[PDB]
Amino acid sequence: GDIFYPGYCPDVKPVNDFDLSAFAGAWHEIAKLPLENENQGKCTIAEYKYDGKKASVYNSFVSNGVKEYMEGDLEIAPDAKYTKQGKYVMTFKFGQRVVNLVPWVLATDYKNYAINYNCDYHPDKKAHSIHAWILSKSKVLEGNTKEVVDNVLKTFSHLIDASKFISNDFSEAACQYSTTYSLTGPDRH
Amino acid sequence: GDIFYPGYCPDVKPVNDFDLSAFAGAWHEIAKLPLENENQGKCTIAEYKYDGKKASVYNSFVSNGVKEYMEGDLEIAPDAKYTKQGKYVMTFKFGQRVVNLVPWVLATDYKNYAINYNCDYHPDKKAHSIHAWILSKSKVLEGNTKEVVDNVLKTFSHLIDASKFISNDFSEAACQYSTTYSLTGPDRH
Ligand SMILES: C=Cc1c(/C=c2\[nH]/c(=C\C3=NC(=O)C(CCC(=O)O)=C3C)c(C=C)c2C)[nH]c(/C=C2\NC(=O)C(CCC(=O)O)=C2C)c1C
Ligand SMILES: C=Cc1c(/C=c2\[nH]/c(=C\C3=NC(=O)C(CCC(=O)O)=C3C)c(C=C)c2C)[nH]c(/C=C2\NC(=O)C(CCC(=O)O)=C2C)c1C
Secondary structure, eight states: OOOEEESSOOOOOOOSSOOHHHHOEEEEEEEEOOOGGGTTOEEEEEEEEEOSSOEEEEEEEEETTEEEEEEEEEEEOHHHHHHOOSBEEEEEEETTEEEEEOOEEEEEOSSSEEEEEEEEEETTTTEEEEEEEEEESSSSOOTHHHHHHHHHHHTTTTTOOGGGOEEOOOOHHHHOOSEEEESSBTTOO | OOOEEESSOOOOOOOSSOOHHHHOEEEEEEEEOOOGGGTTOEEEEEEEEEOSSOEEEEEEEEETTEEEEEEEEEEEOHHHHHHOOSBEEEEEEETTEEEEEOOEEEEEOSSSEEEEEEEEEETTTTEEEEEEEEEESSSSOOTHHHHHHHHHHHTTTTTOOGGGOEEOOOOHHHHOOSEEEESSBTTOO
């Protein structure tokens, strides 16, 4: 199950001076906090492409030999347009269902790692769930960068319980797929 | 039991431009979050006296006809001296045991109400307990002021669960006492 904690989401401020073009690229999910929709995928990678005017997203993972993917639009969050903070929206369409995902970027050096997060409040439960992802431009978080990440993460110890991260897998095996499948699309729901 | 929530205490900033002389006086505890040491006392009042150089505290409550009290020193918290925020220390001595209590003042209008709080982190439990007190210069929080308090409290909804407050009692009966007893003192532990 996803991780929930009592009460409203805590105050949090994402990264300043966010640079979307610098952020663009293929991000590997080295690890994440449990997230129902993606708990079973492996070799999880999110690829963001930028035009200067337009941004798009290509997300994929592999489940039992199948490569599932999603294609959508990406844009800076309306409020972040004014503050210049790292907050973006990913819009995906499943038939008539439209989804607007909003990851918050707590920190990143743009070339090697990113620490993303979200807080989802359930009023009916008076509790919130927390989601987080350790992202890297390499399939492995390597030694220098590993230390960098760990120290940064530490400054967010009151927002993310590091001990709850779950490592993803990028072995050739894990990433292997015999076939594909688009989760997004007009003939979806 | 006291109220605990998981993780480290959240970020919080107490009232700005704190004025100790204006704060001085007798504060009635209209309500509080459960706090073991004082759960049984009634007619609970904290009285702070200021010289301009020196501040002292006189705390009291009544348990079964007995008026228990504590006498100590009061001073602005070392860090608050620089920031001018509302944070103070109460030092009490029980024999050789010395206690340094630190309430944080979230908000106050000085003449009628104050909203005090604290967060105690237990590393061995990876959780923190939260304490809070609604204080008033009158034995009753009256109508205008009640509305004022409620609206202020609302801005702290992510830090204090209002529904957990417990009302104190200031009836003549409650405050009645046949005898006294000093909890503080040299012949204490
Ligand atoms: C790794 C970077 C990454 C990521 C990756 C990701 N998710 C994926 C999968 C999915 N995302 C989804 O949203 C759904 C469900 C789609 C549906 O509604 O049917 C799936 C299966 C895939 C590959 C397919 C990939 C690469 N997904 C996010 C962000 C998110 N993924 C989320 O589900 C949410 C909302 C969380 C919440 O409910 O509160 C956010 C912010 C980030 C930051
Ligand atoms: C109402 C204002 C008020 C108050 C009142 C108060 N407490 C009292 C009682 C006590 N306070 C104490 O600390 C102890 C235990 C003393 C001991 O260590 O033996 C007792 C019995 C009395 C009357 C006696 C009164 C008026 N006490 C506080 C503040 C506090 N009371 C606390 O116990 C703590 C630490 C909480 C924690 O453990 O994390 C704080 C900040 C405020 C802001």
